[PDB]
Amino acid sequence: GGVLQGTYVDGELNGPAQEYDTDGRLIFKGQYKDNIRHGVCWIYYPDGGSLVGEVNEDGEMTGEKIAYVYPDERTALYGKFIDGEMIEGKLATLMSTEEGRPHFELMPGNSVYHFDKSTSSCISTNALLPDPYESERVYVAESLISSAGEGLFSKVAVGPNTVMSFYNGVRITHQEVDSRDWALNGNTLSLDEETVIDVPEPYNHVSKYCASLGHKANHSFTPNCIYDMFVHPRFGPIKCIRTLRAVEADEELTVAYGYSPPGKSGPEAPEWYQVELKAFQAT
Numbered sequence: 331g332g333v334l335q336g337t338y339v340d341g342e343l344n345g346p347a348q349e350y351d352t353d354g355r356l357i358f359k360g361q362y363k364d365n366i367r368h369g370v371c372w373i374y375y376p377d378g379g380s381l382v383g384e385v386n387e388d389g390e391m392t393g394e395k396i397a398y399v400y401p402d403e404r405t406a407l408y409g410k411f412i413d414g415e416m417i418e419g420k421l422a423t424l425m426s427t428e429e430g431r432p433h434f435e436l437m438p439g440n441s442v443y444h445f446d447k448s449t450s451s452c453i454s455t456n457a458l459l460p461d462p463y464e465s466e467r468v469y470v471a472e473s474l475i476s477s478a479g480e481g482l483f484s485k486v487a488v489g490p491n492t493v494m495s496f497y498n499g500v501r502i503t504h505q506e507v508d509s510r511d512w513a514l515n516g517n518t519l520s521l522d523e524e525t526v527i528d529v530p531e532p533y534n535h536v537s538k539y540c541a542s543l544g545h546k547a548n549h550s551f552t553p554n555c556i557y558d559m560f561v562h563p564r565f566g567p568i569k570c571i572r573t574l575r576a577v578e579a580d581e582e583l584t585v586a587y588g589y590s591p592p593g594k595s596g597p598e599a600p601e602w603y604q605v606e607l608k609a610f611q612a613t
């Protein structure tokens with residue numbers, strides 16, 4: 331599936347090439363040499379992020395100068411990667427692109443980021459190491475909504491379809507979430523058919539966990555954001571918060587929580603939600 335526009339020299343791929351996904355989105359741009367990815371290549375993710383760097387002998391993203399670039403196409407985690415996996419990335423800025431080749435400038439400080447996919451019990455190896463892309467776009471504060479605890483706010487004005495925050499957390503089964511005390515489900519977010527993401531009790535406090543902040547976004551029936559899929563260099567496959575339209579600086583980010591046909595919709599919706607739902611219906 332999907333098209334691969336290539337340059338061939340006697341049977342094998344040799345020269346520039348560009349690949350697209352079934353949807354016609356550019357997922358790869360670079361070149362091949364004897365049917366193998368060669369030189370500085372770019373891998374583009376559906377969510378807007380990407381991988382770029384001097385590929386190795388086997389055509390993979392393995393090197394000491396590989397980089398993951400966030401959706402703003404400016405914030406980057408530059409460093410050591412093995413076959414696309416971030417082993418030791420340092421915060422940097424993509425200054426410019428010279429003939430397809432990127433130029434990175436490290437940011438002050440030597441914090442190291444690495445692939446650290448959560449487990450059912452470990453949410454992160456550095457719960458208090460913030461996400462640099464998040465630090466630029468959002469902040470947590472008392473929600474403008476009444477009796478709704480903390481909310482998530484935009485630091486600057488941005489347009490529609492902008493990735494603002496990441497929803498990372500421990501990974502557990504739907505079975506476990508549907509069968510346990512529902513009072514423990516305030517932060518559960520369905521990732522897919524087999525995994526639910528949760529930011530369990532202790533970590534729901536910014537003073538204990540600030541690696542991602544998506545779980546701080548409150549609900550609204552007229553939301554300005556939606557939950558979207560995201561492949562993070564550090565968190566791995568998770569969900570993120572993306573704007574549905576332009577948002578002002580200091581505007582509160584909200585999303586419509588998921589509450590399918592009767593029965594096949596899992597646990598009942600919280601009391602606060604049901605209340606607002608009625609108040610909303612025929613507002």
Ligand SMILES: C[S@@+](CC[C@H](N)C(=O)[O-])C[C@H]1O[C@@H](n2cnc3c(N)ncnc32)[C@H](O)[C@@H]1O
Binds near residue numbers: 478517534545550602
């Ligand atoms: C995913 S958290 C969002 C952040 C949370 N308010 C906090 O301070 O950490 C979900 C919880 O926030 C509250 N919440 C979200 N949207 C709300 C709303 N519209 N009205 C009241 N409470 C809301 C309730 O306790 C709820 O279960």
